[PDB]
Design a binder for this molecule. Sequence first.
Ligand SMILES: *[C@@H]1O[C@H](CO)[C@@H](O)[C@H](O)[C@H]1NC(C)=O
Ligand SMILES: Nc1ncnc2[nH]cnc12
Length: 246
Amino acid sequence: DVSFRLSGADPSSYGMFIKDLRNALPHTEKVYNIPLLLPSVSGAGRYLLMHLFNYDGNTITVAVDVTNVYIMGYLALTTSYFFNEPAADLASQYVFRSARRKITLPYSGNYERLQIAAGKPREKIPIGLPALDTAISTLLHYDSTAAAGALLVLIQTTAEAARFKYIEQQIQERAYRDEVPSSATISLENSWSGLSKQIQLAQGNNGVFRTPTVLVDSKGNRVQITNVTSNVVTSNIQLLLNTKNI
Ligand SMILES: *[C@@H]1O[C@H](CO)[C@@H](O)[C@H](O)[C@H]1NC(C)=O
Ligand SMILES: Nc1ncnc2[nH]cnc12
């Protein structure tokens, strides 16, 4: 499957990892030239395993649902960890079976619950490659409060980067120095399901959105996306959540 090493990492090797991540996700269709994620996949094939190595070369393996890029759980050493949600519970039937013990985290995997658990919102959590290195290290030694913050970092630097070229670039820019995400980054993370839906509805509507998506731009101004000619659609989003899953 897919792998990333913090040791010796630079914007280029990180770019390569995110390309591999994207390429690991199956699709039979591109909508407006953007891969469309499958409505569903049955069995173990539903889950991609990412091998992540911290600077010291310690590893965790992260389980990702290939239909939505949602992290379900991870394996650190001989212990598996899964979010407290039905979908992750299902995932546990298929991944890291050979783990000696299984811990269920005291929270689900969505941003609202993770931010509560961590004690701070994504806006205040620095991200980048050094932050990912830290996050890997944290997840290696169970601590549920610290893990929440680690998971917010991990999620944004893997799944959200795969979904948006702008987020990938934000992280490449933070290769050697962490920084809290721009509001544009937060906006995009928030809008993924909504943009995926509207890009899909745009087919058979002459590339026009049924409902406009309000984003925040790089310069910090609130903009609305109304059609597929927008740069968000042509030059940013890289994966579409299948409408069947919305
Ligand atoms: C499509 O969106 C652009 C902004 O990106 C806007 O200027 C244009 O008016 C829109 N076109 C239509 C047909 O709505
Ligand atoms: N658990 C998760 N995995 C991937 N992306 C997410 N966005 C919010 N929660 C997420």
